[PDB]
Amino acid sequence: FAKLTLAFSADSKTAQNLS
Amino acid sequence: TTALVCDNGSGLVKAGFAGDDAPRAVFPSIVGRPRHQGVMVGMGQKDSYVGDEAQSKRGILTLKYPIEHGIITNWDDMEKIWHHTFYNELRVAPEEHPTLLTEAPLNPKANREKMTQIMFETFNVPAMYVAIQAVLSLYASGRTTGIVLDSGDGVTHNVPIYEGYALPHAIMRLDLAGRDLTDYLMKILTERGYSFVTTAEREIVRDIKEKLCYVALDFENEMATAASSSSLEKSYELPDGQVITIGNERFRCPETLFQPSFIGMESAGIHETTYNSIMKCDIDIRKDLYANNVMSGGTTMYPGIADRMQKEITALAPSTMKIKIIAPPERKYSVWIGGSILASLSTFQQMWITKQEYDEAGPSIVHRKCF
Amino acid sequence: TTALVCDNGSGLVKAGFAGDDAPRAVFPSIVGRPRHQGVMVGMGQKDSYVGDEAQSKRGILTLKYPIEHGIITNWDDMEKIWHHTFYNELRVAPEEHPTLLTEAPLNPKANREKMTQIMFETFNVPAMYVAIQAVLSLYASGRTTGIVLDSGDGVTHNVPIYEGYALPHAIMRLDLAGRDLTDYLMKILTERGYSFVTTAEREIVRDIKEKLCYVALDFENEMATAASSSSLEKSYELPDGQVITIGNERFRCPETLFQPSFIGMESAGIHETTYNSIMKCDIDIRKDLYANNVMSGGTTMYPGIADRMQKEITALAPSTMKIKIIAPPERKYSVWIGGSILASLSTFQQMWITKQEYDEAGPSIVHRKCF
Amino acid sequence: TTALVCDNGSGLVKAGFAGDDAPRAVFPSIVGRPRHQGVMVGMGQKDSYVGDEAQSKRGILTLKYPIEHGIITNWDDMEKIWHHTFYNELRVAPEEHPTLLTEAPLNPKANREKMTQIMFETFNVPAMYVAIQAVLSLYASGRTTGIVLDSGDGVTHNVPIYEGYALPHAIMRLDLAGRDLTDYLMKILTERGYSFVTTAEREIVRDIKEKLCYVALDFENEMATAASSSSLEKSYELPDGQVITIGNERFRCPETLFQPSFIGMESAGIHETTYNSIMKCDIDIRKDLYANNVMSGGTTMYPGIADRMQKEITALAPSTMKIKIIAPPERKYSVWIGGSILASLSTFQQMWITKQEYDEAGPSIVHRKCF
Numbered sequence A: 001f002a003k004l005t006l007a008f009s010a011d012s013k014t015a016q017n018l019s
Numbered sequence B, C, D: 001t002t003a004l005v006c007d008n009g010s011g012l013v014k015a016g017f018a019g020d021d022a023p024r025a026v027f028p029s030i031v032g033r034p035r036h037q038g039v040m041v042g043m044g045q046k047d048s049y050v051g052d053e054a055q056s057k058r059g060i061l062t063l064k065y066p067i068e069h070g071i072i073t074n075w076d077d078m079e080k081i082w083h084h085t086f087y088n089e090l091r092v093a094p095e096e097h098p099t100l101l102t103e104a105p106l107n108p109k110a111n112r113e114k115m116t117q118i119m120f121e122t123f124n125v126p127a128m129y130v131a132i133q134a135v136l137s138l139y140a141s142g143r144t145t146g147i148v149l150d151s152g153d154g155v156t157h158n159v160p161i162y163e164g165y166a167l168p169h170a171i172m173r174l175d176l177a178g179r180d181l182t183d184y185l186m187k188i189l190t191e192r193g194y195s196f197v198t199t200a201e202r203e204i205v206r207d208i209k210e211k212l213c214y215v216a217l218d219f220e221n222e223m224a225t226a227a228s229s230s231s232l233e234k235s236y237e238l239p240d241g242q243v244i245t246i247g248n249e250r251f252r253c254p255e256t257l258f259q260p261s262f263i264g265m266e267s268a269g270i271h272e273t274t275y276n277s278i279m280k281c282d283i284d285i286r287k288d289l290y291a292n293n294v295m296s297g298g299t300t301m302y303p304g305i306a307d308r309m310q311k312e313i314t315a316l317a318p319s320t321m322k323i324k325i326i327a328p329p330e331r332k333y334s335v336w337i338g339g340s341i342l343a344s345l346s347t348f349q350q351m352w353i354t355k356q357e358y359d360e361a362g363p364s365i366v367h368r369k370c371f
């Protein structure tokens, strides 16, 4: 009921291609 | 804050800033996916190519249009189009910039609902608006009254406006535009011997239609001319270097716009659609719609269409009325230019759909706030 | 831990490490067995001779090639080839090094099954992998797109790759390469009075083919030139001391690559095979592929082949295309160099077939894991 | 005067008289030419063999197909096909007998031009007509409404007809049929070690496809069953006496008809083609089209195809529709049987294209008169 009240309250890419 | 105008048309996304004269980012709305087997490891192998990159690498891609006849079918693809046109083309943050979108009339409402929900939850804005394209075209024409035939790549719609009062019972929608012309050109190019079956070849046939096709003034005389002598024939070079030569198919492809029964549709052409949209209006304003036939859209960019439209409406109208087709040279981007009017107007600043109004009213304020 | 690259071609095993420029061990894959009555006891007599030793004592041996047209028939001989190239040529432990092997396209699957079985059970590895040779050739050319004509000793295949995406329906395979040219030169060297019928004499005719032969630019004009004047005739010295002299057979032997009907085959030449493998691809990418003809293998090491190939492709293609052929001077071992590209890549560490996956799935995981 | 029906298919010519149940002359359309050096003088050595003679002596011949995907490329070879099928098989004078022909839909028009020109000039008939094969299949089914999937050796086309009224905007052509299946079986037979490269071997692989292959009801369960146990494996005897044994390749060969991406084609299978051709039609005829799926052609002669087609269409259609695949046992020749209907009708006699109309209007009346 407390959880219901709280819940519903109203770069790597360029280095790869080079290598 | 400067605003954004992003015309999400069926064929070409036209996006850019407010107050400008020309659209900054014009790119086609296709999403490409690789259909073969990759053998080279690495190399930045993306699972999807969006836009002009999908135009560039198109020999190994399947291209999917997210929009068909003004209705967004695939929504993740449309999210990828919006992500590309915000982050890659414009390089803008949508959390600090307003956005005006254009929409065809007589659209299903859930398209507008999911457009509003994606624009307010995934690319969440301070404000956005959804407008009618014909009102923006009549803004860009510089006049208050007029009938607008707007024909993009999926939707040809006629909307008349008199003194800023649109008549909603005279709006006439026809689902015939340049993608159906592309498919009919792919159908009739196989008569001469040239076969185009894949989605990559649709762009080549669309480029043939954009470069070579034109609206005939008289279809029977042009067919007799093309049957008699080979003066109307024109040549085009394919990307592999082969040269094709086409004849009467230059003008048979836009003739579907005046005769839909070539592609099996029962409905009449655009000239009787415009004439019935005129005759559905009240009797005092029809003369003021006879002299202000504003054309827009890229499909009205053929260099024979205004004289043919004037001839057909002058044949349909009574003879004591002046027919004047308003055909600006910049009618291709014109709806975007109308957004660049309407984002810059001082009276439009109270007509934004704000984020607090959306969070208060759910996704239901877009029907009562817009048209 | 460095990897191993071992191109097991039909004629020459090219083996070595990864990360190195030159192949460390290049030696032909022959197994010699004695065919005469041994009369001296002792003297280091061996029941088998593998490699250059079998090239050294080839007058008193029968030489067997374990690989014919990419398909290994005798498997104990292939085990002796692998044991010689691991323990004697390279002198390394195969239990502590991964080993990449190459393969012709459209090879039978049971060859890959028995290769995986012998690599995991007789010469048991940390890992192994089976790759395509044309991908390594396109790695050695330094580009991403291109069509590869590889031509070793048994298999000549055309593989087109665009942006790292191979087209598996456009791969073409022809069983015509330098061993068939050596047998055709053995057939036509009996025209001038020189008889070569043994397997020892095939090495001498292969040396004549390697040293003196060249590709004519035009076959009919060069045949008329050789028939008219004795200017193209060259002399070669046999190892016993005899001197032979040959004329038009310098350019009749590699003409069979451009004309297979000399040796009675229904298949077309390598230029029409390259043109058909280009024309089987999609129409957008062909302008790249005409600019990126990549040749590899020792059979393309004749000093007349690139100009003849450019003339034939330029005659076949339309005139608006730039016909470029990339033929590097180190194209004899470049496939191996491409293996030394691929095994030293950081992204290739995840694509190895381990011992544990082999013991899980049997010797059948190499079909689903590789190409 | 008894008419003639000559279905010039892509793989097999089927010719015969009208008023007959079975086709009299069924023979494959190949033109053979000898590729070897004839050494025995005399003995009636013909330079070309046409038809079953080309099947008889095929070890020393290169066989050429004059028709590729419904489009006749080589026209002198097609004249040899027509001269053989008139004078040798049927043994008839062409100038005293009318001859209906058949044609694939969406054919290039110059094929029809040259077909009419050779049929009116070389083999000068009194009258001829060019029709559509699917209308003949719907004639031979006995019904009036229905959608026809006709799949031959080059062309698989779907044509819907309701009450004698075709819908030409829903005709869907796919260039994937039994020659592509024969080439795909030639590609996948090399996994087991059997190599088939020449055109003589293509007849052997086509005979293997005709005898042993079948359509799986479910592809994945059949693949798991063939991978698990060797119960589906079958044997076949080659003409040299070697025995081959095949497993999953019995059902991997026609599975390209339901998944074209095996051979690198972007388009969807024949079931999605049939469903999209049904959904392209008007709505009120659709219940008549779901209940009358008529199949014809030899490519629909596998013994699993009707249940798979019913399962796929019932998966695609809504659940309240009665799917009924009409699969007669005589569907291999059924198009010819429909020609035997249409040549024998009393109302067809006014619809002949005469010699006098040809001489009046050139070779251009075949577009205006036929469909």
Ligand SMILES: Nc1ncnc2c1ncn2[C@@H]1O[C@H](COP(=O)(O)OP(=O)(O)O)[C@@H](O)[C@H]1O
Pocket (backbone or CB within 6 Å): B007, B008, B009, B010, B011, B012, B013, B014, B028, B029, B151, B152, B153, B154, B178, B179, B206, B209, B210, B211, B213, B297, B298, B299, B301, B302, B332
């Ligand atoms: N110059 C031209 N001539 C003929 N047709 C054109 C021309 N320019 C564009 N088109 C057609 O118009 C369409 C573009 O119109 P547009 O309104 O920009 O489409 P969208 O906004 O839906 O992408 C394209 O699909 C193209 O086929």
Ligand SMILES: Nc1ncnc2c1ncn2[C@@H]1O[C@H](COP(=O)(O)OP(=O)(O)O)[C@@H](O)[C@H]1O
Pocket (backbone or CB within 6 Å): C008, C009, C010, C011, C012, C013, C014, C028, C151, C152, C153, C154, C178, C179, C206, C209, C210, C211, C297, C298, C299, C301, C302, C332
């Ligand atoms: N310089 C050369 N000129 C002409 N032919 C050559 C030359 N070098 C090698 N060859 C021939 O080309 C063939 C291809 O060599 P290679 O691809 O290394 O064979 P494999 O790798 O299959 O053993 C060799 O069998 C050889 O006969």
Ligand SMILES: Nc1ncnc2c1ncn2[C@@H]1O[C@H](COP(=O)(O)OP(=O)(O)O)[C@@H](O)[C@H]1O
Pocket (backbone or CB within 6 Å): D007, D008, D009, D010, D011, D012, D013, D151, D152, D153, D154, D178, D179, D206, D209, D210, D211, D297, D298, D299, D300, D301, D302, D332, D333
């Ligand atoms: N029993 C069979 N099973 C599967 N395919 C077959 C069988 N018999 C014939 N075929 C295929 O049908 C083709 C012949 O079709 P055909 O009657 O010529 O159609 P079309 O006349 O439209 O070309 C052949 O190429 C063959 O591959």
Ligand SMILES: [Mg+2]
Pocket (backbone or CB within 6 Å): B007, B008, B009, B010, B133, B152, B153, B297, B335
């Ligand atoms: Mg638009």
Ligand SMILES: [Mg+2]
Pocket (backbone or CB within 6 Å): C007, C009, C010, C151, C152, C153, C297, C335
């Ligand atoms: Mg090699």
Ligand SMILES: [Mg+2]
Pocket (backbone or CB within 6 Å): D007, D008, D009, D010, D102, D133, D152, D335
């Ligand atoms: Mg047929």
